[PDB]
Amino acid sequence: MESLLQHLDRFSELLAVSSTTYVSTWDPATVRRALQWARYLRHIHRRFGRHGPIRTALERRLHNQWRQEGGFGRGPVPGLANFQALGHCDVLLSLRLLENRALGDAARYHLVQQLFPGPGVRDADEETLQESLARLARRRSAVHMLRFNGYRENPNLQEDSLMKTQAELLLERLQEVGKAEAERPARFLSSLWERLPQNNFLKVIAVALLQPPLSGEGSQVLVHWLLGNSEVFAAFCRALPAGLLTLVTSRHPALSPVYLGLLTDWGQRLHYDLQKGIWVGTESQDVPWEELHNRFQSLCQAPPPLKDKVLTALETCKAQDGDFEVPGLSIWTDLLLALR
Amino acid sequence: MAQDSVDLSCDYQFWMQKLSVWDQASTLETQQDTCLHVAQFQEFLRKMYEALKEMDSNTVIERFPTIGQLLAKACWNPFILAYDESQKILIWCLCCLINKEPQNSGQSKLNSWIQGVLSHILSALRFDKEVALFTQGLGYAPIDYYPGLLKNMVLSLASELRENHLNGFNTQRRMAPERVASLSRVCVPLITLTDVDPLVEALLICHGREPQEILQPEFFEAVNEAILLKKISLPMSAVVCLWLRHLPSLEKAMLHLFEKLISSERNCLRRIECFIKDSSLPQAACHPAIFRVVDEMFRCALLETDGALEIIATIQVFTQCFVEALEKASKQLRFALKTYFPYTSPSLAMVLLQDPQDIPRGHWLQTLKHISELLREAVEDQTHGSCGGPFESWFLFIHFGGWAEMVAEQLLMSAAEPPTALLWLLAFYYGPRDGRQQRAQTMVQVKAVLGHLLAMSRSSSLSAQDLQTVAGAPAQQLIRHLLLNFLLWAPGGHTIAWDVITLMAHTAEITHEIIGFLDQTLYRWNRLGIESPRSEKLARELLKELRTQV
Amino acid sequence: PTMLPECFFLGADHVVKPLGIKLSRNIHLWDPENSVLQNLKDVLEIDFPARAILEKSDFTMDCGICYAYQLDGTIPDQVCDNSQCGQPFHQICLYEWLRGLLTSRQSFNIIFGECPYCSKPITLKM
Amino acid sequence: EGVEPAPWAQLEAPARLLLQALQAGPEGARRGLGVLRALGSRGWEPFDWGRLLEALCREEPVVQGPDGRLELKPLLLRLPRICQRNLMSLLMAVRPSLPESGLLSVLQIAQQDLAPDPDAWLRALGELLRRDLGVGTSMEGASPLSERCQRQLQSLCRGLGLGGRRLKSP
Ligand SMILES: [Zn+2]
Ligand SMILES: [Zn+2]
């Protein structure tokens, strides 16, 4: 147990500096030492990697490593991301050394000779490194070919295939932080939100909110994070399509009332003009009639637990603004009419 | 030490001008063309590997002219870099061209270029942008999501196909048939990638309602080949539907059985039985359409040879496997036997289906004596409402082992006063389409021979020349086989078997034939559970030594 | 006709086997000069019932699509709302069928369509 | 735009059910027999094959080849390709109770003379059905197989010792 700490941290440091362009002093000696250590780790993951205090101890060490670094400023180094990546740490290191242009020639040669001896060692008991790298190239080409010859961007994002992989990555990253319990998920989500492209992130969130559990703590954390942060939810309900938010809300009743408040507020900031028979907003970024009609139509074409809720939230806002029965006076009258 | 350059220096120019035509297969025609030629390309690269391995880099300039352009063109085409071992060899070729200690700038530029192209193979972000951006934030390297993404990509596609099948004649959303053909072309280079197998099985089961074939025959052949070498392991429903939608693929599969019984595993019926049961043909042949075409290729082989014993045994094995699978998996509403064997009287088949495991060893004589009677009726009394002829009733009778081989051994068990109807059956076996004058002459010769053999058996252990006297034609193989059955049967054997075998094994064809015979016999015995350990050990030793002469 | 027929057995694997055996033993005793019944009775060496049940015959209680009882644990449960059909089905067979037809329309967990045999409104709740 | 009605739409319901049944893959054929017994069971105990075998030849128009070319396809070539191969299979199974004039018109379609890109299975089930009538001896090299497989099978049987039996007759 303690024997493995100085091994693992040392390997993580060597790996992290591997990707860095200081590689001048490296030699066949360094690379051999690297790969023998990596063999030891790959063996460990195999031997006693499941169901013990050792697995959880290593996870603790890894996640503490990944949070003391965090991934801000001095280096956004991946590192081996999780306990499963121990089983292929040696491949990562190798890939990084092939990317380091600053690698010396004799080092590179010894390296490539140790990855690719040839078919002289076609018979091997352990799935060796050359097979692993060939099998990696295969998968990569397979992924490219499906994307450009078969794949189609599904409209029902939940059922698409890129988004559903991102989602499950995010969900794994929430579960790991929950078990870690060092810093709260809200912090992780906030940091994510600043770094990377927001509209993409939001699409992803929508779909992650719907994936069934893989042990619903994942979704349960995100609902709380979102209800805490209004601005994102302002851009959330603004960016996605209708049916997705409809399925979201039927799934999570905690999201229903606020979302209706958001829609109700966009209704109340329209004005009718008599010359063109259309509700319009004054400002340009105020949702147009068509989008607001869309969302309400999606919400009303839903399971009954939500249909009565949205319908009642609309009638109460109609009666609130004078109980007219004729168009040109109340956005809420025009909605209730454009439903029958 | 003959060519060393010439055929290869031609192939080089052929492939290089072809890679130049191809590269990256972003169209339909480059794709179909790559998927065809790729297999040879692989071999070409193995030979090229051998060539560059034995020699060294940066010193020699033989084909160093354009090796670079060749390996690049190869690498950016992904239908090449995803086939069975192409990528691994392409790595090797670039590892040979590297140099440890560069001197001239050309060697350094080469090594850099090699790192570049290797990195393109392994580690380039030619994927969608936003998905790349998302991962770096979460701290994921390509390797530790590539697998799930593929997996999750495949399942998606499989569902869509599944849904297109159920929407047959439905107002929605028709999966554009262009994309189905596209997927079918993309699965072909990477069929030995385990991660895609889910997609294949869905493509083959989800035939669709389109009357034209939407998949292209480069796809059926690849799957078919790969089922037979056991490199894909699909489930049975998929292979049965592949057979049923692409008959030239069932021909190429049933030929791959004939090479198994002609070349590799001649007269080892255990390895044939193992192969047939493991292959799916018996399970697939419960479908009458496939049994009429599999049976038609057996007939073509039965006619090309004029009744080769090796073909007969294979047919017997096949039919025994087929029977307990027709039986096994059709409880209510199965097809009627005049639908698999449509020429003969169904009566006859209904008799010959009854396994001899079920019958006591003593009642085999009665059953044979009855079958003989009904066969004689069906051939000689060739009236309307019967077989097409003698050959057809023969070709039936051949399908059922057990019955056809026990005949001689029952004549020997009843060697005192042989029944003429059994003599008829036996003579009929070794030659139909003879006419009564021939069949009678053969039968009376055989009866005289049986007279000689009973006398010789009840005598002591005698020579082999006394046997060559009565052996001394068109009726030789019958007498030969009867005499072999006599050797194995009589306890006078195991002493003088060699003396007859050496003399009978004139050529290699008679030897192979006798080997086949003995294998068939031991298979038959071990199956029926009928055994005298003298004959078992005797035949095993003889077979052992005769397998040496070949 | 008088010649031997094609005959085989459906039912209980334990009851039929001795019958197949007895048949095998007596098949040589078949004779096309008697009647089919008069031959079968002495061949299988048993007698028949003369309409043992006339009312409750085996009303086929099978999928009427796949023709099997016991499809994957499932039972013929989904039935026809019709006195003249009354035909049971399976969830899976009847779902894959109704999702095909052009007439059918799907609510939330319900599909309404036509019974395959009689073409009457039938409902399936997943 | 892309809604297509099922081409068996307009037929007497029983035929519609049969053809619907055969659609369902390779266990499609078996099902057919259950369908025929499950219509022997119902009010119309006999099944009027002569009408289905007329309706299978009736022609309608299609537009195939380049973009515009009007062609007339009978029904048998227009309904889904696994239904074709399991129809002809179920006719192989129940040949005896069929009128020959109709059957022959169908085989006449199946033979697909001078079609390019034929359906090998339809042709081979044509030929095996002809052989089962006997009126389709045909005096041809009309075999179920391809010429290609028969040549490589001659090519293979040659590497085996021909037998003393006499099966082919002068
Ligand atoms: Zn069912
Ligand atoms: Zn009904």
Tab-separated table of C-alpha atoms in Angstrom, chain B residues 159-465:
chain	number	residue	atom	x	y	z
B	159	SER	CA	-31.312	1.253	-33.566
B	160	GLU	CA	-32.022	3.426	-36.473
B	161	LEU	CA	-31.845	0.309	-38.715
B	162	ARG	CA	-34.011	-1.606	-36.323
B	163	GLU	CA	-36.564	1.198	-36.525
B	164	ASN	CA	-36.447	1.418	-40.259
B	165	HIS	CA	-37.347	-2.267	-40.367
B	166	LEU	CA	-40.482	-1.853	-38.281
B	167	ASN	CA	-41.591	1.196	-40.184
B	168	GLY	CA	-42.448	-0.960	-43.203
B	169	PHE	CA	-45.218	0.935	-45.026
B	170	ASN	CA	-45.497	3.746	-42.509
B	171	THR	CA	-45.949	7.473	-43.137
B	172	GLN	CA	-42.842	8.580	-41.253
B	173	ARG	CA	-39.198	9.055	-41.555
B	174	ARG	CA	-37.718	6.617	-44.060
B	175	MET	CA	-34.025	6.005	-43.444
B	176	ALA	CA	-32.526	7.164	-46.698
B	177	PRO	CA	-31.340	4.061	-48.524
B	178	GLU	CA	-28.118	5.812	-49.473
B	179	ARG	CA	-26.948	5.770	-45.852
B	180	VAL	CA	-27.716	2.030	-45.442
B	181	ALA	CA	-25.472	1.244	-48.350
B	182	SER	CA	-22.895	3.576	-46.985
B	183	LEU	CA	-22.846	1.790	-43.622
B	184	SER	CA	-22.607	-1.501	-45.419
B	185	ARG	CA	-19.502	-0.365	-47.184
B	186	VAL	CA	-17.991	1.061	-44.013
B	187	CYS	CA	-18.402	-2.075	-41.907
B	188	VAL	CA	-16.396	-4.167	-44.460
B	189	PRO	CA	-12.855	-3.159	-43.842
B	190	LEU	CA	-13.320	-3.399	-40.121
B	191	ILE	CA	-15.265	-6.676	-39.651
B	192	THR	CA	-12.595	-8.143	-37.453
B	193	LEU	CA	-13.010	-5.125	-35.135
B	194	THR	CA	-15.060	-6.508	-32.256
B	195	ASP	CA	-16.642	-3.104	-31.585
B	196	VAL	CA	-18.852	-3.178	-34.687
B	197	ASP	CA	-20.237	-6.563	-34.565
B	198	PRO	CA	-23.507	-5.170	-33.181
B	199	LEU	CA	-23.956	-3.202	-36.312
B	200	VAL	CA	-23.538	-6.198	-38.667
B	201	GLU	CA	-26.111	-8.337	-37.004
B	202	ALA	CA	-28.571	-5.518	-37.262
B	203	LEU	CA	-27.848	-4.797	-40.920
B	204	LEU	CA	-28.446	-8.487	-41.854
B	205	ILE	CA	-31.583	-8.960	-39.861
B	206	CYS	CA	-33.042	-5.582	-40.959
B	207	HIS	CA	-33.613	-6.414	-44.589
B	208	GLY	CA	-36.131	-3.730	-45.303
B	209	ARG	CA	-38.984	-3.551	-47.787
B	210	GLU	CA	-37.012	-2.184	-50.720
B	211	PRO	CA	-37.325	-4.729	-53.616
B	212	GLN	CA	-33.814	-4.003	-54.966
B	213	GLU	CA	-30.773	-5.167	-52.957
B	214	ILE	CA	-29.714	-2.113	-51.002
B	215	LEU	CA	-26.500	-3.660	-49.732
B	216	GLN	CA	-23.758	-4.222	-52.247
B	217	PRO	CA	-22.194	-7.606	-52.822
B	218	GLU	CA	-18.805	-6.569	-51.604
B	219	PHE	CA	-20.527	-6.633	-48.176
B	220	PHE	CA	-22.071	-10.083	-48.381
B	221	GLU	CA	-18.873	-11.716	-49.412
B	222	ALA	CA	-16.850	-10.186	-46.597
B	223	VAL	CA	-19.294	-11.339	-43.885
B	224	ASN	CA	-19.553	-14.761	-45.494
B	225	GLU	CA	-15.805	-15.333	-45.718
B	226	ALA	CA	-15.404	-14.069	-42.160
B	227	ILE	CA	-18.114	-16.456	-40.746
B	228	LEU	CA	-16.267	-19.397	-42.208
B	229	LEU	CA	-12.845	-18.589	-40.849
B	230	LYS	CA	-14.409	-17.907	-37.421
B	231	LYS	CA	-13.200	-14.285	-37.254
B	232	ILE	CA	-16.577	-12.750	-36.542
B	233	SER	CA	-18.869	-15.062	-34.630
B	234	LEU	CA	-22.314	-13.822	-35.500
B	235	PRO	CA	-25.481	-15.400	-34.242
B	236	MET	CA	-27.320	-18.027	-36.285
B	237	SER	CA	-30.334	-15.922	-37.299
B	238	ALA	CA	-27.947	-13.402	-39.001
B	239	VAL	CA	-26.058	-16.055	-41.008
B	240	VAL	CA	-29.357	-17.742	-42.039
B	241	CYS	CA	-30.661	-14.488	-43.360
B	242	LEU	CA	-27.363	-13.730	-45.171
B	243	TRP	CA	-27.643	-17.212	-46.928
B	244	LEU	CA	-31.283	-16.557	-47.762
B	245	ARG	CA	-30.648	-13.120	-49.326
B	246	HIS	CA	-27.437	-13.851	-51.332
B	247	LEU	CA	-27.335	-17.298	-52.961
B	248	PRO	CA	-23.850	-16.868	-54.410
B	249	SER	CA	-22.643	-16.520	-50.873
B	250	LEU	CA	-24.189	-19.985	-50.028
B	251	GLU	CA	-22.438	-21.463	-52.942
B	252	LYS	CA	-19.151	-20.019	-51.753
B	253	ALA	CA	-19.838	-21.405	-48.339
B	254	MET	CA	-20.796	-24.902	-49.431
B	255	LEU	CA	-17.643	-24.984	-51.668
B	256	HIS	CA	-15.643	-24.179	-48.610
B	257	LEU	CA	-17.094	-27.486	-47.254
B	258	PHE	CA	-16.032	-29.406	-50.277
B	259	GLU	CA	-12.429	-28.169	-49.868
B	260	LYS	CA	-12.714	-29.426	-46.292
B	261	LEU	CA	-13.580	-32.944	-47.446
B	262	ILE	CA	-11.242	-33.019	-50.502
B	263	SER	CA	-8.000	-31.298	-49.426
B	264	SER	CA	-7.495	-30.738	-45.699
B	265	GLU	CA	-9.388	-33.421	-43.740
B	266	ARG	CA	-9.897	-36.357	-46.127
B	267	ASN	CA	-11.589	-39.256	-44.306
B	268	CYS	CA	-11.481	-37.877	-40.786
B	269	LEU	CA	-15.224	-37.828	-40.244
B	270	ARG	CA	-14.893	-36.581	-36.658
B	271	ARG	CA	-13.361	-33.297	-37.909
B	272	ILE	CA	-16.049	-33.082	-40.578
B	273	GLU	CA	-18.853	-33.697	-38.088
B	274	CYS	CA	-17.294	-31.054	-35.800
B	275	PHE	CA	-17.027	-28.596	-38.685
B	276	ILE	CA	-20.638	-29.159	-39.897
B	277	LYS	CA	-22.242	-28.851	-36.487
B	278	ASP	CA	-20.145	-25.765	-35.673
B	279	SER	CA	-20.828	-24.177	-39.100
B	280	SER	CA	-24.560	-23.440	-39.299
B	281	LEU	CA	-25.497	-25.314	-42.360
B	282	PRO	CA	-27.600	-27.865	-40.570
B	283	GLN	CA	-29.454	-25.168	-38.681
B	284	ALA	CA	-29.847	-23.150	-41.901
B	285	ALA	CA	-30.933	-26.128	-43.877
B	286	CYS	CA	-34.116	-26.404	-42.008
B	287	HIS	CA	-35.301	-23.855	-44.545
B	288	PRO	CA	-36.503	-25.662	-47.727
B	289	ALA	CA	-35.118	-23.147	-50.000
B	290	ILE	CA	-31.538	-23.751	-48.610
B	291	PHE	CA	-31.869	-27.462	-48.531
B	292	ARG	CA	-32.834	-27.544	-52.178
B	293	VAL	CA	-29.730	-25.599	-53.140
B	294	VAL	CA	-27.350	-27.292	-50.802
B	295	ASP	CA	-28.685	-30.636	-52.062
B	296	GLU	CA	-28.201	-29.516	-55.673
B	297	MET	CA	-24.508	-28.918	-55.095
B	298	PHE	CA	-24.104	-32.321	-53.574
B	299	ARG	CA	-25.817	-33.856	-56.661
B	300	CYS	CA	-23.446	-31.980	-59.038
B	301	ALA	CA	-20.520	-33.493	-57.047
B	302	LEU	CA	-22.159	-36.950	-56.976
B	303	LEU	CA	-22.294	-36.893	-60.827
B	304	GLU	CA	-18.831	-35.395	-61.515
B	305	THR	CA	-17.288	-38.357	-59.760
B	306	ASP	CA	-19.264	-41.504	-60.670
B	307	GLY	CA	-20.156	-42.244	-57.059
B	308	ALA	CA	-17.030	-41.398	-55.005
B	309	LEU	CA	-17.213	-42.958	-51.528
B	310	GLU	CA	-15.787	-39.742	-49.960
B	311	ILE	CA	-18.724	-37.596	-51.108
B	312	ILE	CA	-21.199	-40.245	-49.956
B	313	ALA	CA	-19.844	-40.133	-46.393
B	314	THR	CA	-19.982	-36.385	-46.209
B	315	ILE	CA	-23.585	-36.514	-47.383
B	316	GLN	CA	-24.367	-39.088	-44.713
B	317	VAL	CA	-22.888	-36.892	-42.004
B	318	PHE	CA	-24.677	-33.858	-43.213
B	319	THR	CA	-27.976	-35.643	-43.315
B	320	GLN	CA	-27.570	-36.979	-39.771
B	321	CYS	CA	-26.861	-33.476	-38.460
B	322	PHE	CA	-29.761	-32.030	-40.465
B	323	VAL	CA	-32.227	-34.599	-39.171
B	324	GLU	CA	-31.819	-33.851	-35.479
B	325	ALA	CA	-32.074	-30.186	-36.228
B	326	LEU	CA	-35.205	-30.433	-38.341
B	327	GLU	CA	-36.506	-32.494	-35.436
B	328	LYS	CA	-35.054	-30.320	-32.665
B	329	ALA	CA	-36.528	-27.012	-33.665
B	330	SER	CA	-39.908	-27.311	-35.364
B	331	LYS	CA	-42.565	-28.435	-32.988
B	332	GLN	CA	-45.916	-27.509	-34.662
B	333	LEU	CA	-45.980	-26.678	-38.401
B	334	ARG	CA	-42.882	-28.144	-39.941
B	335	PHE	CA	-42.499	-28.770	-43.654
B	336	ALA	CA	-43.598	-32.158	-45.073
B	337	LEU	CA	-40.759	-34.501	-46.242
B	338	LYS	CA	-41.910	-34.422	-49.870
B	339	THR	CA	-40.677	-30.805	-49.631
B	340	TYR	CA	-37.084	-31.587	-48.899
B	341	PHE	CA	-36.963	-34.873	-50.904
B	342	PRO	CA	-39.595	-34.099	-53.505
B	343	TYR	CA	-38.925	-36.770	-56.150
B	344	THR	CA	-39.292	-40.116	-54.315
B	345	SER	CA	-42.326	-41.675	-52.723
B	346	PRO	CA	-42.593	-40.088	-49.280
B	347	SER	CA	-43.280	-43.580	-47.901
B	348	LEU	CA	-39.656	-44.605	-48.579
B	349	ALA	CA	-38.075	-41.614	-46.845
B	350	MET	CA	-40.452	-42.048	-43.826
B	351	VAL	CA	-38.885	-45.538	-43.533
B	352	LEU	CA	-35.296	-44.489	-43.976
B	353	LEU	CA	-35.587	-41.668	-41.400
B	354	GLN	CA	-36.050	-44.203	-38.568
B	355	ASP	CA	-32.669	-44.279	-36.826
B	356	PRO	CA	-31.048	-47.695	-36.161
B	357	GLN	CA	-30.098	-46.637	-32.645
B	358	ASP	CA	-33.831	-47.052	-31.969
B	359	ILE	CA	-33.974	-50.631	-33.344
B	360	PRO	CA	-32.534	-53.795	-31.742
B	361	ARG	CA	-29.433	-55.109	-33.515
B	362	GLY	CA	-31.394	-58.302	-34.351
B	363	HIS	CA	-34.338	-56.553	-36.070
B	364	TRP	CA	-32.139	-54.679	-38.573
B	365	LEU	CA	-32.457	-57.585	-40.989
B	366	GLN	CA	-36.271	-57.290	-41.100
B	367	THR	CA	-36.198	-53.549	-41.715
B	368	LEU	CA	-33.623	-53.814	-44.491
B	369	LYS	CA	-35.572	-56.700	-46.071
B	370	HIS	CA	-38.658	-54.427	-46.114
B	371	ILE	CA	-36.797	-51.386	-47.502
B	372	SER	CA	-35.344	-53.557	-50.248
B	373	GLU	CA	-38.865	-54.618	-51.233
B	374	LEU	CA	-40.102	-50.998	-51.484
B	375	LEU	CA	-36.949	-49.831	-53.333
B	376	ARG	CA	-37.257	-52.722	-55.859
B	377	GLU	CA	-40.880	-51.586	-56.423
B	378	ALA	CA	-39.822	-47.982	-56.902
B	379	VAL	CA	-37.013	-48.656	-59.411
B	380	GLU	CA	-37.942	-51.735	-61.510
B	381	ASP	CA	-41.756	-51.245	-61.495
B	382	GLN	CA	-41.238	-47.675	-62.793
B	383	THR	CA	-44.872	-46.731	-63.399
B	384	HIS	CA	-46.597	-43.335	-63.170
B	385	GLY	CA	-46.876	-41.930	-59.647
B	386	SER	CA	-43.336	-42.835	-58.598
B	387	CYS	CA	-39.717	-41.685	-58.810
B	388	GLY	CA	-38.262	-40.013	-61.914
B	389	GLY	CA	-35.968	-43.057	-62.274
B	390	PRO	CA	-33.466	-45.353	-60.596
B	391	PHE	CA	-30.850	-42.649	-59.981
B	392	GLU	CA	-33.255	-40.570	-57.901
B	393	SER	CA	-34.306	-43.422	-55.613
B	394	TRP	CA	-30.604	-44.154	-55.330
B	395	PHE	CA	-29.658	-40.567	-54.475
B	396	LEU	CA	-32.238	-40.716	-51.696
B	397	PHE	CA	-31.061	-43.998	-50.266
B	398	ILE	CA	-27.494	-42.528	-50.192
B	399	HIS	CA	-28.469	-39.726	-47.845
B	400	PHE	CA	-29.087	-42.140	-44.939
B	401	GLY	CA	-26.004	-43.713	-43.513
B	402	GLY	CA	-26.495	-46.444	-40.964
B	403	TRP	CA	-28.730	-48.353	-43.373
B	404	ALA	CA	-26.572	-48.434	-46.496
B	405	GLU	CA	-23.416	-49.733	-44.684
B	406	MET	CA	-24.946	-52.341	-42.352
B	407	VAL	CA	-25.991	-54.371	-45.432
B	408	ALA	CA	-22.857	-56.431	-46.098
B	409	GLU	CA	-22.354	-56.994	-42.351
B	410	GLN	CA	-25.910	-58.378	-42.138
B	411	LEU	CA	-25.291	-60.615	-45.159
B	412	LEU	CA	-22.267	-61.971	-43.286
B	413	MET	CA	-24.356	-62.420	-40.116
B	414	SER	CA	-26.850	-64.390	-42.314
B	415	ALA	CA	-24.143	-65.749	-44.667
B	416	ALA	CA	-25.777	-69.184	-44.566
B	417	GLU	CA	-28.468	-68.908	-47.289
B	418	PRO	CA	-28.308	-65.162	-48.084
B	419	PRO	CA	-31.693	-63.513	-48.785
B	420	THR	CA	-31.929	-62.450	-52.448
B	421	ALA	CA	-33.716	-59.156	-51.559
B	422	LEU	CA	-30.672	-58.107	-49.493
B	423	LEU	CA	-28.415	-59.234	-52.343
B	424	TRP	CA	-30.613	-56.993	-54.526
B	425	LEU	CA	-30.215	-54.026	-52.216
B	426	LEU	CA	-26.461	-54.434	-52.060
B	427	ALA	CA	-26.061	-54.847	-55.838
B	428	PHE	CA	-28.325	-51.833	-56.274
B	429	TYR	CA	-26.113	-49.756	-53.987
B	430	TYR	CA	-22.892	-50.245	-55.938
B	431	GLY	CA	-24.583	-49.850	-59.304
B	432	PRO	CA	-27.988	-48.647	-60.377
B	433	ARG	CA	-28.941	-48.092	-64.047
B	434	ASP	CA	-27.597	-51.534	-65.027
B	435	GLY	CA	-30.618	-53.593	-66.139
B	436	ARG	CA	-31.745	-56.935	-64.777
B	437	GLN	CA	-29.249	-59.009	-66.796
B	438	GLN	CA	-26.349	-57.128	-65.141
B	439	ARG	CA	-27.933	-57.003	-61.699
B	440	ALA	CA	-28.697	-60.742	-61.814
B	441	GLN	CA	-25.163	-61.671	-63.043
B	442	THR	CA	-23.660	-59.523	-60.275
B	443	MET	CA	-25.995	-61.053	-57.670
B	444	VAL	CA	-25.178	-64.652	-58.640
B	445	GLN	CA	-21.417	-63.853	-58.639
B	446	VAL	CA	-21.849	-62.290	-55.176
B	447	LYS	CA	-23.781	-65.327	-53.938
B	448	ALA	CA	-21.007	-67.654	-55.144
B	449	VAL	CA	-18.461	-65.325	-53.472
B	450	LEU	CA	-20.481	-65.507	-50.218
B	451	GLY	CA	-20.447	-69.310	-50.573
B	452	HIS	CA	-16.634	-69.126	-50.784
B	453	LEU	CA	-16.392	-66.718	-47.833
B	454	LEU	CA	-18.602	-68.697	-45.406
B	455	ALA	CA	-16.542	-71.827	-46.191
B	456	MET	CA	-13.303	-69.830	-45.719
B	457	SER	CA	-14.502	-68.248	-42.431
B	458	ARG	CA	-15.599	-71.583	-40.943
B	459	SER	CA	-12.189	-72.850	-42.078
B	460	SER	CA	-8.989	-71.889	-40.237
B	461	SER	CA	-6.974	-68.676	-40.698
B	462	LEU	CA	-5.971	-69.041	-44.367
B	463	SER	CA	-3.772	-67.195	-46.882
B	464	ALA	CA	-4.490	-64.090	-48.979
B	465	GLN	CA	-3.945	-65.754	-52.403
